[PDB]
């Protein structure tokens, strides 16, 4: 019937992730989403934001307490630094018992700075009985879904093997004197493994509809000191410490078919995912949330066939969050009208419809932990039970 009332923690018109992605989506989908509540530590900014965006329905709350309690909210969105997720969401969840209308809790990836915090958060979310949503928007990319479709329909045949090559961000030999210090210190929830590799390995499991059984990882900090740089792209003859990793080696096996997976992630061509099937090979590529290109190959007298799938002018960064929101709306308003559906689901798993949940994020955090665990202990781990309960 009526639009979904959205309360935002982390929406800021001046800066941040939510203004570039979440807002533009909620803007397009005004018929279905409405922002009714903002919370910042500084109330002046919440208010400033409401005026710059002319949020004719937004109320700027002064406290987490007040915000989380308000019954003018159907969905809360958390879009703040990962290091503050746990400290803000655990309280918020307690307070939120004073809102009978709360239905959805939407949290950005990563969920927390550690598997422990992530478990606590998931536990608490369940106790609260709301539907949850994590921001693994890769699951909504047009490329990922076509690939998944092709694969699940037998178009490449059985998966023989997979290779992944990846590039990570500012974890090369250089750092913008701009970018913060919290990005480059371990345990703050943002890094090569948790982020770049997290998003990628997830879409891999999702496209192939399989989890891992065994994995082995080596994690590197071969670049402990980074070279600062300006906006011109020139070095400022200044060095800064970096405790987060600059390289990740990862190999493992998928449960379904015991498929070999070789992966390399570097800190500095953004992304290549090579899936070799018995009938066709499938390749996904990137440059500069993309993923921007999908390619399929087939093999006196032989024929070769190349299928390219490319959306000419597509903005993945806003594109994927959009489709995530759209997918939440289609679930709420039941656009494909299936009267026979309950109001809530634990996880998406490998289903096409719906969206990733905190349970999906938890499983991922479990896989991330196991990676680090593998590296330190220097051993190959059996991870095939991760993804059992909660």
């Amino acid at each position: 019937a009526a639009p979904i009332r959205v309360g935002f923690v982390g929406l800021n018109a001046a800066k941040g992730w939510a203004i570039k992605t979440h807002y533009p989506a909620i803007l397009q989908l005004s018929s279905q989403f409405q922002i009714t509540a903002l919370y910042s530590p500084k109330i002046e900014t919440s208010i400033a934001t409401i005026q710059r965006l002319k949020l004719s329905n937004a109320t700027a709350f002064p406290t987490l307490e007040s915000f989380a309690s308000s019954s003018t909210i159907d969905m809360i969105v958390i879009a703040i630094q990962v290091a503050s997720h746990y400290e803000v969401v655990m309280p918020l969840l307690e307070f939120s018992k004073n809102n009978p209308n709360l239905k959805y809790l939407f949290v950005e990836w990563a969920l927390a700075c550690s598997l422990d915090q992530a478990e606590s958060i998931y536990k608490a979310a369940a106790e609260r009985g709301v539907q949850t949503i994590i921001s693994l928007q890769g699951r909504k990319s047009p490329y990922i879904l076509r690939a998944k479709e092709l694969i699940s329909q037998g178009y490449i045949g059985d998966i023989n093997s997979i290779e992944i090559a990846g590039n990570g961000g500012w974890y090369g030999y250089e750092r913008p004197v701009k970018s913060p210090k919290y990005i480059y210190e371990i345990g703050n929830g943002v890094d090569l493994v948790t982020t770049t590799f997290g998003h990628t390995i997830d879409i891999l499991q999702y496209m192939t509809s399989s989890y891992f059984s065994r994995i082995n990882a080596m994690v590197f900090n071969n670049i402990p000191e980074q070279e600062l740089i300006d906006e011109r792209g020139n070095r400022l003859g200044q060095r800064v410490p970096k405790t987060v990793p600059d390289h990740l080696l990862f190999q493992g096996t998928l449960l379904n078919g015991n498929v070999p997976v070789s992966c390399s992630f570097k800190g500095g061509k953004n992304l290549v995912i090579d899936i070799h099937g018995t009938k066709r090979d499938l390749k996904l590529e990137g440059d500069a949330a993309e993923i921007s290109n999908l390619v399929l190959y087939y093999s006196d007298a032989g024929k070769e066939i190349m299928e390219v799938y490319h959306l000419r002018n597509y903005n993945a960064i806003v594109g994927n969050i959009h489709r995530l929101y759209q997918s939440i709306s289609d679930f709420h308003f039941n656009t494909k009208k299936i009267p026979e559906l309950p109001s809530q689901f634990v996880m998406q798993g490998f289903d096409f419809e719906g969206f990733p949940t905190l349970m999906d994020a938890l499983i991922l955090h479990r896989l991330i932990e196991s990676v680090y665990k593998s590296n330190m202990m220097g051993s190959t781990l059996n991870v095939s039970n991760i993804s059992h309960y909660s």
Binding site: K15, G16, W17, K20, Q81, G169, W170, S179, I183, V190, A289, I317
Partner: peptide
């Protein structure tokens, strides 16, 4: 860029 977070 804001995407590096």
């Amino acid at each position: 860029t804001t995407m590096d977070d």
